[PDB]
Every structure is written in structure tokens, then in C-alpha cells.
Amino acid sequence: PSLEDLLFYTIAEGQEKIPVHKFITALKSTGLRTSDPRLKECMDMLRLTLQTTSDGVMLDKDLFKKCVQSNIVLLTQAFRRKFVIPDFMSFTSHIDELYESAKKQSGGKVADYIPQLAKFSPDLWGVSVCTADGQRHSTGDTKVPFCLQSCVKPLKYAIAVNDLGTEYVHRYVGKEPSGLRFNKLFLNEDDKPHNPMVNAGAIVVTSLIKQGVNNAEKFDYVMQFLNKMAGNEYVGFSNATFQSERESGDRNFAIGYYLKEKKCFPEGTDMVGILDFYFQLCSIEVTCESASVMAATLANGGFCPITGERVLSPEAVRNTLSLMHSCGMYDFSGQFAFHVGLPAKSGVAGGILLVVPNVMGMMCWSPPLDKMGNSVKGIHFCHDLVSLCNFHNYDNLRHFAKKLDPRREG
Amino acid sequence: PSLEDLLFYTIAEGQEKIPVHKFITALKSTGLRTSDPRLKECMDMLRLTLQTTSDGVMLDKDLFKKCVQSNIVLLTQAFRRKFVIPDFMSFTSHIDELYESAKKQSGGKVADYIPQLAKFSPDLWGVSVCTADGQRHSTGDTKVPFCLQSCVKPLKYAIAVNDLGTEYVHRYVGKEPSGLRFNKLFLNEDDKPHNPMVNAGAIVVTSLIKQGVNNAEKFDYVMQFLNKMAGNEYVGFSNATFQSERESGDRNFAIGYYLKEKKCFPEGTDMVGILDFYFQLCSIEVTCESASVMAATLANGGFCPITGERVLSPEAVRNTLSLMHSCGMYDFSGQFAFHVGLPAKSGVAGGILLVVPNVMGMMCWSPPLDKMGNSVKGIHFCHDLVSLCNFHNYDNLRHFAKKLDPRREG
Amino acid sequence: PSLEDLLFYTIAEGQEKIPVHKFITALKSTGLRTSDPRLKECMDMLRLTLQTTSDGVMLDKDLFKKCVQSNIVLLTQAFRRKFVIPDFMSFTSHIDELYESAKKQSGGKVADYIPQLAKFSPDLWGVSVCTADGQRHSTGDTKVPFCLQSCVKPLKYAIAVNDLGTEYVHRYVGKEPSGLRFNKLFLNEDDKPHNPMVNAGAIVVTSLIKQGVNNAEKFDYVMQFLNKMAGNEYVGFSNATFQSERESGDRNFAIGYYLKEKKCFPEGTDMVGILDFYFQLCSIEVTCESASVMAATLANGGFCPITGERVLSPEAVRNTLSLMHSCGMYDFSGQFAFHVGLPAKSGVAGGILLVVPNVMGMMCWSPPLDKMGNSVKGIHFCHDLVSLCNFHNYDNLRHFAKKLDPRREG
Amino acid sequence: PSLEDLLFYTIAEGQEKIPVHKFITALKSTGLRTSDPRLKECMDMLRLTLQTTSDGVMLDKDLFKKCVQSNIVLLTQAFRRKFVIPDFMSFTSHIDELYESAKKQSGGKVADYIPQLAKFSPDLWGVSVCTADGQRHSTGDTKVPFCLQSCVKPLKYAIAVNDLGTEYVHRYVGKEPSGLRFNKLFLNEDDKPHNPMVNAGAIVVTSLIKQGVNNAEKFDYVMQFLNKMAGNEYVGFSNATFQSERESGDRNFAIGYYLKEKKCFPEGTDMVGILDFYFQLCSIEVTCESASVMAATLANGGFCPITGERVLSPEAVRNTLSLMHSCGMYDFSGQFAFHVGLPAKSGVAGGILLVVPNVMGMMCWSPPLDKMGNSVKGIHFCHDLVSLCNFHNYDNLRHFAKKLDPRREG
Numbered sequence A, B, C, D: 001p002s003l004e005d006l007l008f009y010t011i012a013e014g015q016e017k018i019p020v021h022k023f024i025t026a027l028k029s030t031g032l033r034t035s036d037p038r039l040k041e042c043m044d045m046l047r048l049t050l051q052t053t054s055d056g057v058m059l060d061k062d063l064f065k066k067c068v069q070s071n072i073v074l075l076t077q078a079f080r081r082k083f084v085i086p087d088f089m090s091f092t093s094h095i096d097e098l099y100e101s102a103k104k105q106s107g108g109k110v111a112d113y114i115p116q117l118a119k120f121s122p123d124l125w126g127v128s129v130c131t132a133d134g135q136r137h138s139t140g141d142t143k144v145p146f147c148l149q150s151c152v153k154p155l156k157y158a159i160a161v162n163d164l165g166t167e168y169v170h171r172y173v174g175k176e177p178s179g180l181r182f183n184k185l186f187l188n189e190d191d192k193p194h195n196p197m198v199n200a201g202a203i204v205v206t207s208l209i210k211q212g213v214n215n216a217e218k219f220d221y222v223m224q225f226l227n228k229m230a231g232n233e234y235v236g237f238s239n240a241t242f243q244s245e246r247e248s249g250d251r252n253f254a255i256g257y258y259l260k261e262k263k264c265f266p267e268g269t270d271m272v273g274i275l276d277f278y279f280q281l282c283s284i285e286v287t288c289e290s291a292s293v294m295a296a297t298l299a300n301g302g303f304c305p306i307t308g309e310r311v312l313s314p315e316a317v318r319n320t321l322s323l324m325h326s327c328g329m330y331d332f333s334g335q336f337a338f339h340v341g342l343p344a345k346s347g348v349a350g351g352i353l354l355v356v357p358n359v360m361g362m363m364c365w366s367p368p369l370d371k372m373g374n375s376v377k378g379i380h381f382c383h384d385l386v387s388l389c390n391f392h393n394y395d396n397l398r399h400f401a402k403k404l405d406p407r408r409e410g
Ligand SMILES: O=C(Cc1ccccc1)Nc1nnc(OC2CCN(c3nnc(NC(=O)Cc4ccccc4)s3)CC2)s1
Pocket: A184, A185, A186, A187, A188, A189, A190, A191, A258, B180, C184, C185, C186, C187, C188, C189, C190, C191
């Protein structure tokens, strides 16, 4: 018979008509959101159907078939456990417990150099997960908005390489980490910044994106890009943080003039204008939830997991994850790579963009920072997750000891 | 039916009586070598049958099963295309092309600071592949013995961590890469060597291994350990190279006394003694083939692909792969990391020990080195390998553009 | 039998009277100039005397005594070879041979990074000598005005210490050379610039001068201070150099913002304003002749030698010569300290301000610079000087080999 | 009218016959020691006169002449205040206050890294002055022998340059201070040690002295050289310190091999042989008194003040004072040069070898060191000396404010 109601008998159990509330509760348990863009046709029909028959609320064979025929491919995969994490309900409990285990880590100091980011209660703590199949889960303050800050750095690097290619972008900027407390330097021996993840590298990267338009079009061009990446979830902009960031980044200006004087920018660059653009991209706002989609886009070869849409070339995404692995956690990058072994990127607002390649993207957020600039709970969470799961970049898929593999059965 | 005669019809192909050579031929085409340890009881039963009447030999449903009972599970996986690389025959055609491509790169200079090394013709070039399922292929001078040199460093880090655990080992040696030209500073800021892949670190690591027995026992122990990792293929020792490496190795003696004075060795370490242990270890010999198994052991979570034996703990194997990633190719390390994205370790003899986690282990060998001391042909091969396949640590398993995935058939 | 009358007979030689030209010749050969401020009385009398009856042109013992009356003590020392260099007419011969030898050094590039220094002919070459007694000498292009540039660094440092003292000034700036490729860094291990002789230090020093008045007042102040130091010989300003230096000084802005960021300036500093004042100070013009007097004030413990006025404290002068010793010649400081062993300071305009303590002060000017930014002719000249005379600051006064001592009789 | 005569009635009274005790007392007051080698023929005669004509002890016009005639030139200069410091008795008062003021400085830790220096009481404190004319003064523990250690470094460099010239020696060793903390590096950018005053430099310089002879003869040759510099005062040897310094000198062996590897030693250099020679030179013993005579030879252009014997070339003496100036007090070198401005060399035994060129030499001794490695009382004394006297390199001889100048009379 048909795909469309092989799947029916599947959910229908023994009876002949599936309640609407049952089917929905099934769908939700596969971790799909009833607001999933890929499921719009089917949810709209259901809603239309609840209207045109108060008479209900149960779906027979053909009623079910005229709702799910629209998105039958994605609905089949979800219901037959063909997603990257099959028992997703089990998984999210573990996530919750990791969350609670972290929440108890009261250490750290809120970034206060800008008045805006000391307006956030330290209590706040959120984690959001988006799988490469569009499975979602959150716990904590995942709907509070904050600035990306340095979390934006791999995102705009990715745009450059997507628009300009590996070879060109790296005429201007390095690809290695700089060395334990080989820190205070701006350029390396070839008079390029060390990599996209440091400020000096980021600033140069900013100067390549959409060259030859003004700092309003460049800004919108990038937001368009991020909007696609986040499946059109929340992507705002705090100007309060921008005016503060600019009237305060003396160090950044030092970096600007230093790069100028050493001719690090492309020909015909307006350096002070790049600095405003840079301060702007730092002020872009996300929620845990929206960011986790973005991260999942990196986790998913560049295709946005909840829309299907190709946002980034594989070349861009691969390049980006490579530098997040080595340069992503300020002076904690070497330790984080050893013990965690995941691409991550931290920002001074308490955010940590985290990617488990081929599995999921995440965003942890908690304002209080440790001595190295990283979110304390965020760090504790990340070490826990890889203690529990074989997610380390050099964990084994076949032999992994006491760990748990969310990619498998029971 | 049963697993065994079921497999009989698969090789049969309409026919009545499966010829022996037809079985061997079909066996080889899966990747497995006729001499695989796990196929002992099968091959024995075969050589036994090859004498009940030395004219044939035609296995019926019964004689076939008698010869394949013992190993039916492996034989079934092999023939049902269940191995990590299902179409191995195809795959080794690409390996062979990649080999001829790199064969045309005659640049570089054979090491010569030791007489034992400029004896090697600059045209020696071998590639050996061993997959996590035991599949073998060699093209080139893969049975010529050469010294491991710095290629041994990840193997004795492994051993140490396997015997002593992470926390004890990394009291004495760091775990990050060092810095720009850094081949220079012998210690990080905590007065440990930077990582176990540089000479200061290796030397410390040698001093943690099997403490409190003499150098003769210690060496037997590492040998025994390498024999497990190489599935009992060729592991030797080159006393010539050992002598030449010692009477002409003042830099290692320099580091030794520096380490001793800053108190980097365990209590009661006879430093000069340790150096000679280290010199012996650099002079261990392997072949492309044998070493590619060792490399496949790291690919396979610490279990030897061609015996089944647990050789190293997951902690050891993961730690080693993390540090090879970032520290494994001398100054070229960060560039390797970015472009090739695989754990590898190189050696002044022309060896590059390469690991494709969960897929395979490898060992390339061409004596002529580039200006950073890395085999020219080897480097070229590794670039092409990843240019062609989605083996790069941050390629996507699902969206990989115009790359080939040897793990898939469909 | 007293004072002014011995001086009459020693010149008249028992002749009738004294021819006025004979006296001015005798005077000029002591090294003193006719325009010497300490002689203005004597000279003025002499010209007006040759009017009461110009019918002369002689001098009665009567007539004479009343002219030399006022300056008798100085005119006596001069004529009784009491000055620091007795045989001055012989010394100026060696200076001349030294000028001609250095003149044959074709080499160097003129500073062609700013249109005001590209301006200058490479063939320009001038040397001026002022002893601590006001004995003068010039040869070459010594009345052409040029910008001090970095030659102003010791001067403005001196002023700062003169006004605020050693302790306060050295809260904001260190007192050592940097390291011979710590040339690059801006701050030492205590977040102060390494010393006042380097652009970071100079800028900070600039912020210490006449704090809390505006940049026109501060500038006027330094100008007048430099006027004292040069016995009111030419001190100018080049607005052209000023505009250029500020259109083109991206590195200096880099340094400014770095310092502001690290809180190196005194509280309440307008950093952008201190940069302009700094640019202004570099754009100060002098001639060979006026500058050699400033160098002479340093050689003379802080008294201007041609006027007698206490310009700088001994503390200020000591301090300054200490740092010119070790930090004065850019990357060539160590090689200069060893071989010439004299306090000197060079600038991009081609100048070298050279001090021989307790003896003389000099200024060398030749616009073509070497690869380290020092004047080619200047450097050569300084080496020859100390090859000839026991002026090396660790030469012996009592045992000095094949060298010559301009301070001794025969 | 003879010098012998004039001097007689000079010391007379206008009188008859000088008492012997009145002559000796008068002689001591010029600072000269009764055992001056240049005074020996005269002192024998006095002692001999007291014995013979015991019927005295009044020396008349011809008895006196019979004594002082042998050494009349020097005895004149002594009594006619011709010596470098004319009022020497006044000067010793000052030294004595300086000594007492430093004596109240109980800070410091005595070196403990070998048992030989652990032993030394913390309160030992001695100062000795020898002028370039042989005027001596001691106060405190100045006859106790202690080891030169790094205080030998300037001495053996002087010997190298004396025998081999500047050009040779400085192939092998640099001539600049390392960096305000490049100390840990052994080699500069040209693969030479930074300067003679650091261990790597000292060791290379050791390897240049008397090449091609065994250590017995080499060591003699240096000892014979040291005796000449000290006018034959105490130059001993500590075998105890030798043995300890070798069976514990691991950092030096580190330096030794590094140096061998990078090929800093002259061809045919037995590296370990050189090390032992090095350890021996560091164990050469001196007293404050004998060391002050050595320092005085350096202060005197290479002539030994109390023998008049030419010990070193002026090229050697100049070169050493140069490097003592900028590299002498380990890491405190920059600070010392700025504040004290005299050439000095400190050692871990607590000595400070001090030179006031054209004036005097000095050894201060006091075993407790500061965190920098310098004798605490030593350092204190050096600052106070230059507070009090215009001996700073860049103090002015004509304008020195409120300082005292010991080179002038009333
Ligand atoms: O460190 C300290 C105090 C300190 C000192 C000692 C110990 C611990 C702390 N202060 C400063 N720290 N960073 C500074 O950066 C400044 C701005 C950019 N700079 C540069 N950035 N990048 C370069 N690199 C090449 O110019 C090329 C190169 C050549 C050779 C090796 C590496 C790089 S310079 C140089 C100056 S100032």
C-alpha cells in the first residue's frame, strides 16, 4: 500500500481513528516542533480540519492521509526512529540532568566593562539543542536575548569563505592558534593575524564581507545570512551594547590602526568604518534557541536543519569548525580541545556556541565568566556532556567504554 | 536454514560445487588477506581438506560449512558487504591512483645527519592501508623496514597513559601545541614540556614507562606492546641507527640536562639512562604494512583490527589522537590540521602514520623530506586523500558536495 | 700688575698699541665666536669705540682695558689656554679631516616616507661642535634647518625630569633597553613603555609636561625651554612636517590607543591631543649650529655654555645621558654603546645629537639613513671620532694607547 | 736642590730631625700602605735603621735621604697631594659611614644551592678601596677569603681579549645585554651567547683561553694572570666549591651541550673539558682587599696601581668596563646602570666588583643575596656611594650640585 497510511496503522495502534491529540503527542515526542517550518502544510491542514468538523476530534484513514500527504517523507522518518537521535525523549532527560548539575556552579564574574551586560542577573542559565534533523529541546532561560559578542566570529568568517573562498580569505588571515600565552601579539610572522577567532583576525575578516557597499547594506546582508542560518528564529540587535562597545574599545582601535599601518586590509579599505561594522556584528542578538539552530546549521554540512535550505558551502562550514576546534575558547582552547574535543565558540556575554558534527548544534548561556573569559556553567556543561556521551572528536563509535551513545537504540 | 549454508548459496551462484580458488579469490576481493589471524581455524580446516584427496577441490554445502563454521560471523560480514568500506576493490583503485599522483613529486631531501639514512634511495615509496575491519591494501615498497623515529612518540604516549592514566602522565608533560617557530622553548609556563609530541615531552614520557626495571626489560615491554598493536606483523630494531643516533645527539643531551635541572622527571630517574632508552625507541623498525595495523589499532578504539585483542584503553587512544591532531607534524601541524584534518605523526625516516578514526589506519613512507622534515610524497598523498574523500575530521557525513564516501554503497 | 693689563701686554707683545683686527683674530682662535653672548658688552664697546675716533684703528692700553673690562675673567681663561680643549685650532683640523672622511660615504636612503624628508638633497652633510666653554666650530651645511624628530626625545625627557623629578616620571615610563627583538613590543612586564627613547615612552612622557594647560601653552613652554638650551640660536617649526607626520602616523595612533587602554597616561589625559602635541614636538626645526649648543648644555651639566644660564637640573641631565647611552640609536644602541661609548640620539631627518660629557656637544646631519634608521655619514663620523680621541666613555685618561687627548697640552 | 731635601723639611716642623713614627704616621695618612711594593726599598731601610742606629730614633737630613731616595718620585706625589683623591683621610671617613649605614641592612638570603656557601655567616660584611695611585682602605671583614663565582667573568673576558683581541673573541660571544627578560635564551639571533657576563657567554669565553693546552696549565695561566692584577695579594682556590659546583651543575651541562650542538665552540673543543675548567674558575678565591686591587687595575687602564706593571691592554680594559656597565648585575643591570652608573660585577658568593674609572676599584662582600642575586649590603653601598659622590658615569665634573667630589682639595 501507500506510505501515507502504513504510517497510519503505525500510530493508529489497533483502533480505526487516531485522536488528533494523540498524533500530536507522538510527533512532539520525536522532538519535532509543532511549529516546524517543514511541517507547515500538515499542521495547517490539521488546524483547518479541526475547524471544518467540530464533529471529532478523530482522524480516519483518508482524513489522516489528506493531512500528512504533504510532508510524508519527514513524518515517516520521525515515526520510524530514522532520526540522528532515535530515543530523543530519553536524551532530553540526560540534557536536563546535565543542566541541573551545571546550574549549581555559582562561580564567576559578570562582564561589567560594558554597563549593558552587567544588567543581566547571574542566576540566568539556558541550554538549547537542535539536532541535524530538527529535534529541539531546551531547559532554563533559553528565550532570554543576549549579544553574540565573540560568538559571531565563526559566523562571519563562514560568510567570507562562502562568498570568497578559502584561498582568498586566507591571503589576509591565518589558520593556527597562536600558542599558550603567546597572546598579547596581533600579527604572526607573515604579518597576518593568527586566525579568524581572535579580535585582530575577526576585524580583518569583517573588512572582506560585501566590499564596496556601505555599513548599512553590509549589516543587512549579514543579518539576511544569519536569519537563514537560524531558520528565521530570533536575530535582533542591541544598539545600547553597540554604543557602549564603541565608546570603550580602545584596544580595538589600537588593533585597527596597527593593521592599517602594516597594510593588513584589502586595498581601499576605510578602517574606522570597519571598526563600526565590527562593533555592530558583536551587538547582534540571539536567544539560546535561535542560536542552537545556527550551530546545528554548522553541524549539518551547512544546510539549515529546520528549513532544508542550503545556507553555507561545505567548504565554509568545514573551515569554520576547524578553527573553532583550535582557537575558539580564548586561552582555554588547548585544554577545551583535549578534554572536550568539540568545536565551540565563547563570547563575553556568557554564550558558548557548540557543535557536535553530524549530530547537533547547541547554545549554552550564562553571564558569569571565569578567569579566561568563558562562561562557568557553560564550561561545566560541556565537560559533562562528553563525559556522558561518546561525542568527543576522537571518541570511538564502536568501542567507547562506560559512555552513552545517543545515536543508538537501547 | 543457517548462517553458514546461507552464505554457501551466495558464493555458489547457481553452480553446484564452489571451487576453492573461487572462494579465496572472492575472499581477497573483500579486503581480507588469506593470512588473517581471525581466519586461522577456517584456513586451517581448508589446508586440512586440501589433503583428503589432493585433486579439486569442490566444497559442497557440507564441506564448505565444515571449513567456515568457526569464523562464519566474520565471513558473513565480509561477503554481505558489512565492512566499514563495502566496495574495497573500488576503494583501492583510488588509493592506487593517489599513489601514482604522489609518485611524481621528486622534491625534498633524504635525512643525512645519520649515515644509516642517506643510504635510503629517494625513490622508495610505499602506502599501506588497514581498515578497522581488517581490510588490507599495499601499493609500493611496503615491506622494506625503516625506523619509526618520531613516529614512535604517539605509541609510547599511548602505552604510558594506558599504564598510568591521564592525570599522572600529564603531571609531567603538557597537552597543547606550543607556538610560532616553537621547536625552541623546551618548557611551557608550568615547567612541563609542551606536549608529548615534541622532543622534550617524548623524553619525559619515556621516563614514565615501566619504572623500576632496567632498560633491557623496559625495552622488551614496549616491543611486546608494539607486537600487540601490529597484530604480530613486523616489528624490529636497528642497532646501527641506535649507535649513530646516540654518539651524535647532543641536542637530546642538552634537553636531558635541562629537564633534570628543572626537575621534570619522576623521583629517582637516571636521566642519561633514560636518553638511551629514548634512542633505542627511535630505532624501532616497522614496515609500511606492519605500522598501518598499529595505526588501525588507534582507528579502532584500541582493539587490534586483525586479532580482536584489546591493546589500549579508550582514554589512551583518544588522548593520543587529540595530540597527534594538533602536534603531529612538527611546524606544519596547524596547516596539516586545517587542510588534512586527520591525526598523523611524521618521522625523519620518511614515515607518516595516519589515522582515519572509525574508518582505517595507514602508514606512508618516502625518505625525502621537505623543509619542515615531513615526507614530500606523504604530505602530497594526505592532501589528495582528503581532497577526494570526506575523511576530514570536519567533513559532513550527509552533505559532502562532490566528495566520495567509501563508507557508503548507497 | 693686575687683571686686564696683563691681557693687554700679552697681546700687544710690547708693540706700540693694538690693532683691532689682531685682537679679534687672536680671540677667534681660542674657539670663541665674536657673536658670543658672554662677550656682548666687550664687542659692543669695541665697535662704538671705533667711532670716538675710528681714525684709529688701534687701541690704547687705556682704550683696550675699558672694553675687555667686563669680560676679563672669560677673556683671560681663553687666552691662557684654560678651556677644556687648549689647542682648539688643532682640534678643529681633526674634526675637518673627520668630516671629509665621512663625506665620502655615498650610501643610505633618505627618509622617503613623508614629502618633507624626500625633499632634502642626499648630498647635505654638516657637523657642529660646541665645547662646554663655548668654543665653536662648523664644517659642511650647518646652517640649514631640519626637523629634530626623535632627537627631541631626550630633550623633552629632560624637561619632564627637570620639572617633576626622577621618581614621578618613572612611574609612567621605565629606564632600560628593551631586548633585541623586543623592538616590537610597546610595554614592558610592568605595563610601562620600556624607556623614553622609544615611541611608546616618548608619547607617555609628552603627557607629563605642563599638565592641565592646553596644547598651545604646553608647546610654547617647551619652545622657550629649548631656546634657553640653545643659547637662543635658531629653534624653528615646520608646519609642513607637522601636517605630514599626522596624516601618516597610523603606528603612533596604534600606540596611543594601546596606552590609553592600559592606563599608561596620567589621570585625565586627552590622548588624541597628546598625539598632536607629540607630532608638533617632532616637527621642531634646528640647525647644526643651534643643536650643537643644546648637546653642549647636556655635556655641561645643565648650564648653557655660551650664556652661563642654569637650564636643566643635574638630575635631569644625568638621567638623560644615561638613557641616550643605552637606548639612543634605535636597534643599533648596543653596538653603538660598545664601540663609540658616547651618549647620542638619532632621528629620521638625518640628525645625530652627540654628547661628550665634560668636553663638548655636537650635532651631525646627513639625511641618507642606514637600514636601522641612523645617518650613514653621522654613524661613520662618530666611530672615527672615538678611534682618534680617548672620548670613549670607558677609555682611560692616564693610559690611552695610540689615541690622542684634545684635553692635554702635548 | 734635591727632591729628597725639599720633602725632608716638608715633614720636618721647620725642625731638626723627623721622628720615625711621625714619618710613618704621615705616610699612612696619604692612604699609602706601609707594605706598598713600590715602597719596599724605603721600608727595609727604615726597619734596618731602627735596628742598627737604635740610638735614635730621629732621622736627620741625610739619614732621611738614605731611606726615601729609593722611592722618592712616589713619596713626593704622596706628600704634595698629587694623588687622585688628595684628602684621602677625609674620604675614608665617608666610606666608613657608608659602610655603617649599609651594615644596618639585614635583608637577604645567603645562597644555599651548595653546602660551601650555606656555611657563610649572614653578617660578614667588608668593603675595600684601592685607588689608581695605590691608596688603600678597608673596613669590615676584608681578609676573609670567598669565591669569585660570576665575579670572575669580567676577569677572564679581559684575558681573552688581551691575548686574542676584540675581533676574535666576538666571533664567539656577543656584546649586548640580552633583554629585560631574554635571560632564559642561551643564544641570540646569530647563534652566539648574548655577552660574556651570562653563563653561556662565560662558558664560550672559557673555551677560547689558552687553547690546545690541558686544564692544569690553563688554570695556572689564569691564576698567574689574576695574581698580576691583584699586585700579588691573596689569590687562592676552593677545591671544596669546585667539587660541589660540578656534581650539581646540571644547568651548565644543559648549556654545554646546546652550545656544542649549535657549534658555538672553536673547532676541536672538548666540551666537558671546558666545563670543568669553567667550574674551576668560579671557585677561585679572593679577599675584599686583593679583589679591590684587581678592580683598581681595571680602573687604571690596565696598569696595576701598586706595582706599576702593565697587566692588560687598554682594548681589553675598555671592552670589559663596557660590558660590566650593561650586563654586570644580572637582571638588575638596567636599574644599576641608571641609578649607580658604575661598571660592576656581582657573584652568588655575595661579592660586588666595582670600578670607578680613572679613580678606584672596590670589592664589597656580604653573603646574603636579594631576589635578583645581588648582595643586599653590596647594592645599598653602591647607591649611597653615588648619592654622596659625583662618581656616576654621567655626573658632571664641573656642576654636581650638592654632591661631594673627592678629586678636589678645599
Ligand atoms: O607583552 C607585553 C608585556 C610583557 C612582556 C614580556 C612578557 C609578558 C608581558 N606588552 C605588549 N604585549 N603585546 C603587545 O603588542 C603590541 C601591539 C602589536 N604588536 C605585535 N603583534 N604581533 C607582532 N608580530 C610580528 O610583528 C611578527 C613576528 C615576528 C617574530 C615572532 C612573532 C611575530 S608584533 C607589538 C606591540 S605590547
